[PDB]
Motif scaffolding. Structure first.
Motif, PDB file in Angstrom:
ATOM      1  N   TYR A  41       0.825  -1.178   0.000  1.00 38.86           N
ATOM      2  CA  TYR A  41       0.000   0.000   0.000  1.00 38.86           C
ATOM      3  C   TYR A  41       0.876   1.251   0.000  1.00 38.86           C
ATOM      4  CZ  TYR A  41      -3.598   3.316   1.585  1.00 38.86           C
ATOM      5  OH  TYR A  41      -4.436   4.398   1.701  1.00 38.86           O
ATOM      6  N   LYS A  42       1.859   1.324   0.882  1.00 40.08           N
ATOM      7  CA  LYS A  42       2.685   2.518   0.918  1.00 40.08           C
ATOM      8  C   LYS A  42       3.720   2.513  -0.203  1.00 40.08           C
ATOM      9  CE  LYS A  42       4.177   6.407   2.723  1.00 40.08           C
ATOM     10  NZ  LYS A  42       3.408   7.651   2.370  1.00 40.08           N
ATOM     11  N   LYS A  43       4.340   1.367  -0.471  1.00 40.91           N
ATOM     12  CA  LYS A  43       5.421   1.321  -1.481  1.00 40.91           C
ATOM     13  C   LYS A  43       4.882   1.667  -2.882  1.00 40.91           C
ATOM     14  CE  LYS A  43       9.030   0.322   1.020  1.00 40.91           C
ATOM     15  NZ  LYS A  43       9.248   1.581   1.786  1.00 40.91           N
ATOM     16  N   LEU A  44       3.697   1.166  -3.247  1.00 45.02           N
ATOM     17  CA  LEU A  44       3.149   1.467  -4.556  1.00 45.02           C
ATOM     18  C   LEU A  44       2.715   2.913  -4.591  1.00 45.02           C
ATOM     19  CD1 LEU A  44       0.967  -1.715  -4.944  1.00 45.02           C
ATOM     20  CD2 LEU A  44       2.903  -1.082  -6.369  1.00 45.02           C
ATOM     21  N   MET A  45       2.149   3.391  -3.468  1.00 41.19           N
ATOM     22  CA  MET A  45       1.750   4.774  -3.396  1.00 41.19           C
ATOM     23  C   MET A  45       2.877   5.663  -3.791  1.00 41.19           C
ATOM     24  SD  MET A  45       0.501   6.937  -0.128  1.00 41.19           S
ATOM     25  CE  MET A  45      -1.024   6.046   0.084  1.00 41.19           C
ATOM     26  N   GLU A  46       4.074   5.419  -3.234  1.00 37.97           N
ATOM     27  CA  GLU A  46       5.237   6.210  -3.550  1.00 37.97           C
ATOM     28  C   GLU A  46       5.887   5.911  -4.921  1.00 37.97           C
ATOM     29  OE1 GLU A  46       5.988   8.885  -1.411  1.00 37.97           O
ATOM     30  OE2 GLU A  46       4.068   8.203  -0.582  1.00 37.97           O
ATOM     31  N   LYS A  47       6.005   4.626  -5.255  1.00 43.20           N
ATOM     32  CA  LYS A  47       6.691   4.239  -6.479  1.00 43.20           C
ATOM     33  C   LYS A  47       5.994   4.813  -7.711  1.00 43.20           C
ATOM     34  CE  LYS A  47       9.596   1.604  -8.865  1.00 43.20           C
ATOM     35  NZ  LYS A  47      11.066   1.739  -8.744  1.00 43.20           N
ATOM     36  N   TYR A  48       4.673   4.710  -7.700  1.00 48.28           N
ATOM     37  CA  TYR A  48       3.908   5.062  -8.896  1.00 48.28           C
ATOM     38  C   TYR A  48       3.111   6.347  -8.723  1.00 48.28           C
ATOM     39  CZ  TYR A  48       5.352   0.489 -10.408  1.00 48.28           C
ATOM     40  OH  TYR A  48       6.165  -0.577 -10.772  1.00 48.28           O
ATOM     41  N   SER A  49       3.358   7.090  -7.660  1.00 53.77           N
ATOM     42  CA  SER A  49       2.673   8.390  -7.451  1.00 53.77           C
ATOM     43  C   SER A  49       1.158   8.237  -7.621  1.00 53.77           C
ATOM     44  CB  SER A  49       3.244   9.436  -8.398  1.00 53.77           C
ATOM     45  OG  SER A  49       4.646   9.604  -8.143  1.00 53.77           O
ATOM     46  N   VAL A  50       0.580   7.212  -7.036  1.00 53.58           N
ATOM     47  CA  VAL A  50      -0.809   6.879  -7.352  1.00 53.58           C
ATOM     48  C   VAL A  50      -1.749   8.044  -7.096  1.00 53.58           C
ATOM     49  CG1 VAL A  50      -0.389   4.451  -6.849  1.00 53.58           C
ATOM     50  CG2 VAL A  50      -1.386   5.962  -5.056  1.00 53.58           C
ATOM     51  N   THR A  51      -2.786   8.132  -7.936  1.00 55.74           N
ATOM     52  CA  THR A  51      -3.831   9.114  -7.672  1.00 55.74           C
ATOM     53  C   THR A  51      -4.831   8.593  -6.647  1.00 55.74           C
ATOM     54  OG1 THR A  51      -5.006   8.292  -9.514  1.00 55.74           O
ATOM     55  CG2 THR A  51      -3.618  10.220  -9.932  1.00 55.74           C
ATOM     56  N   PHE A  52      -4.917   7.280  -6.517  1.00 54.57           N
ATOM     57  CA  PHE A  52      -5.770   6.668  -5.501  1.00 54.57           C
ATOM     58  C   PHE A  52      -5.257   5.269  -5.276  1.00 54.57           C
ATOM     59  CE2 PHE A  52      -9.335   3.963  -4.189  1.00 54.57           C
ATOM     60  CZ  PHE A  52      -9.801   4.698  -3.106  1.00 54.57           C
ATOM     61  N   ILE A  53      -5.240   4.853  -4.013  1.00 55.50           N
ATOM     62  CA  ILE A  53      -5.041   3.433  -3.698  1.00 55.50           C
ATOM     63  C   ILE A  53      -5.908   3.057  -2.514  1.00 55.50           C
ATOM     64  CG2 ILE A  53      -2.970   4.013  -2.274  1.00 55.50           C
ATOM     65  CD1 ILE A  53      -1.769   1.259  -3.359  1.00 55.50           C
ATOM     66  N   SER A  54      -6.448   1.830  -2.557  1.00 54.13           N
ATOM     67  CA  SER A  54      -7.243   1.306  -1.452  1.00 54.13           C
ATOM     68  C   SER A  54      -6.810  -0.121  -1.182  1.00 54.13           C
ATOM     69  CB  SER A  54      -8.743   1.397  -1.753  1.00 54.13           C
ATOM     70  OG  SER A  54      -9.092   0.753  -2.997  1.00 54.13           O
ATOM     71  N   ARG A  55      -6.970  -0.521   0.075  1.00 54.94           N
ATOM     72  CA  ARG A  55      -6.627  -1.874   0.538  1.00 54.94           C
ATOM     73  C   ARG A  55      -7.862  -2.474   1.168  1.00 54.94           C
ATOM     74  NH1 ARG A  55      -4.160  -4.069   5.309  1.00 54.94           N
ATOM     75  NH2 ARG A  55      -3.652  -1.981   6.190  1.00 54.94           N
ATOM     76  N   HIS A  56      -8.172  -3.709   0.793  1.00 54.83           N
ATOM     77  CA  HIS A  56      -9.399  -4.356   1.195  1.00 54.83           C
ATOM     78  C   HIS A  56      -9.131  -5.724   1.753  1.00 54.83           C
ATOM     79  CE1 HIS A  56     -11.648  -1.342  -1.302  1.00 54.83           C
ATOM     80  NE2 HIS A  56     -10.488  -1.343  -1.935  1.00 54.83           N
ATOM     81  N   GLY A  57      -9.917  -6.150   2.716  1.00 58.92           N
ATOM     82  CA  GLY A  57      -9.759  -7.499   3.251  1.00 58.92           C
ATOM     83  C   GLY A  57     -10.722  -8.505   2.664  1.00 58.92           C
ATOM     84  N   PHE A  58     -10.281  -9.754   2.525  1.00 56.99           N
ATOM     85  CA  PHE A  58     -11.148 -10.853   2.085  1.00 56.99           C
ATOM     86  C   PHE A  58     -10.565 -12.145   2.590  1.00 56.99           C
ATOM     87  CE2 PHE A  58     -12.067 -14.231  -1.071  1.00 56.99           C
ATOM     88  CZ  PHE A  58     -13.421 -14.349  -0.817  1.00 56.99           C
ATOM     89  N   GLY A  59     -11.348 -12.989   3.235  1.00 55.38           N
ATOM     90  CA  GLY A  59     -10.866 -14.321   3.592  1.00 55.38           C
ATOM     91  C   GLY A  59      -9.438 -14.514   4.103  1.00 55.38           C
ATOM     92  N   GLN A 108     -19.905  -6.425   1.049  1.00 59.08           N
ATOM     93  CA  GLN A 108     -19.595  -7.777   1.485  1.00 59.08           C
ATOM     94  C   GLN A 108     -19.474  -8.660   0.254  1.00 59.08           C
ATOM     95  OE1 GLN A 108     -18.810  -6.228   4.658  1.00 59.08           O
ATOM     96  NE2 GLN A 108     -18.631  -8.469   4.703  1.00 59.08           N
ATOM     97  N   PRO A 109     -18.538  -9.615   0.274  1.00 59.74           N
ATOM     98  CA  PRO A 109     -17.751 -10.105   1.410  1.00 59.74           C
ATOM     99  C   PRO A 109     -16.433  -9.354   1.575  1.00 59.74           C
ATOM    100  CG  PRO A 109     -17.339 -11.497  -0.465  1.00 59.74           C
ATOM    101  CD  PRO A 109     -18.370 -10.462  -0.930  1.00 59.74           C
ATOM    102  N   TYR A 110     -16.262  -8.196   0.959  1.00 57.93           N
ATOM    103  CA  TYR A 110     -15.033  -7.436   1.091  1.00 57.93           C
ATOM    104  C   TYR A 110     -15.172  -6.309   2.080  1.00 57.93           C
ATOM    105  CZ  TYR A 110     -14.211 -10.021  -3.122  1.00 57.93           C
ATOM    106  OH  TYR A 110     -14.029 -11.073  -3.973  1.00 57.93           O
ATOM    107  N   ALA A 111     -14.078  -5.857   2.689  1.00 67.71           N
ATOM    108  CA  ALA A 111     -14.110  -4.736   3.626  1.00 67.71           C
ATOM    109  C   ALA A 111     -12.989  -3.769   3.270  1.00 67.71           C
ATOM    110  CB  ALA A 111     -13.913  -5.213   5.061  1.00 67.71           C
ATOM    111  N   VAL A 112     -13.214  -2.480   3.341  1.00 72.82           N
ATOM    112  CA  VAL A 112     -12.154  -1.505   3.164  1.00 72.82           C
ATOM    113  C   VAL A 112     -11.352  -1.443   4.430  1.00 72.82           C
ATOM    114  CG1 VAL A 112     -11.664   0.927   2.726  1.00 72.82           C
ATOM    115  CG2 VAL A 112     -13.740  -0.205   1.739  1.00 72.82           C
ATOM    116  N   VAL A 113     -10.029  -1.559   4.282  1.00 70.94           N
ATOM    117  CA  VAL A 113      -9.161  -1.418   5.461  1.00 70.94           C
ATOM    118  C   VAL A 113      -8.602  -0.021   5.493  1.00 70.94           C
ATOM    119  CG1 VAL A 113      -7.140  -2.279   6.682  1.00 70.94           C
ATOM    120  CG2 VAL A 113      -8.611  -3.864   5.362  1.00 70.94           C
ATOM    121  N   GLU A 114      -8.072   0.485   4.409  1.00 73.59           N
ATOM    122  CA  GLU A 114      -7.583   1.885   4.349  1.00 73.59           C
ATOM    123  C   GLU A 114      -7.651   2.320   2.900  1.00 73.59           C
ATOM    124  OE1 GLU A 114      -3.372   2.315   5.550  1.00 73.59           O
ATOM    125  OE2 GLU A 114      -2.900   0.327   4.702  1.00 73.59           O
TER     126      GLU A 114
END
Length: 129
Positions: A41-59, A108-114
């Motif tokens: 999440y942080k490394k890609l944010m910086e490497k690719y200057s992302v305009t948006f990134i989200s992290r989600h949980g599943f199983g 559901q069944p996914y959740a946003v973590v950050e």
């Protein structure tokens, strides 16, 4: 319990299967462990200057979704993510249907973590279907 070999099937319609395509794109997804996704999440944010990134949980696993200001080949993004892994699984594909994919990851069944924009993405941030 074997590691996943692909994204969950309920996301298949939104993803590009053409992982070796040499066209460049600007929306990506990664399916991996919680541990690798926390870092990426942080490394890609910086490497690719992302305009948006989200992290989600599943199983017990996580999915990252991200948009980039410049276009990249899926194989380049995969190469970077795979550098973190030896035994941990990691699947990386382009996302064809950006808002549909993100919105499925916010039900559901996914959740946003950050996520990197407060309030997330809006339907009106993309063209209508």
């Amino acid at each position: 319990v074997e590691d996943p070999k692909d994204f969950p099937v309920d996301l298949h319609a939104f993803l590009s299967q053409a992982v070796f395509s040499n066209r460049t794109v600007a929306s990506f997804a990664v399916y991996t462990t919680k541990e690798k996704a926390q870092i990426l999440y942080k490394k890609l944010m910086e490497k690719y200057s992302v305009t948006f990134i989200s992290r989600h949980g599943f199983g017990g696993h996580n999915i990252l979704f991200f948009l980039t200001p410049h276009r990249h080949r899926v194989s380049a993004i995969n190469n970077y993510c795979q550098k973190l892994c030896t035994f941990s699984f990691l699947i990386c594909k382009g996302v064809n249907k950006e808002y549909l994919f993100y919105s499925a990851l916010c039900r559901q069944p996914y959740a946003v973590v950050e996520e990197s924009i407060q309030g997330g993405l809006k339907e009106h941030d993309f063209n209508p279907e």
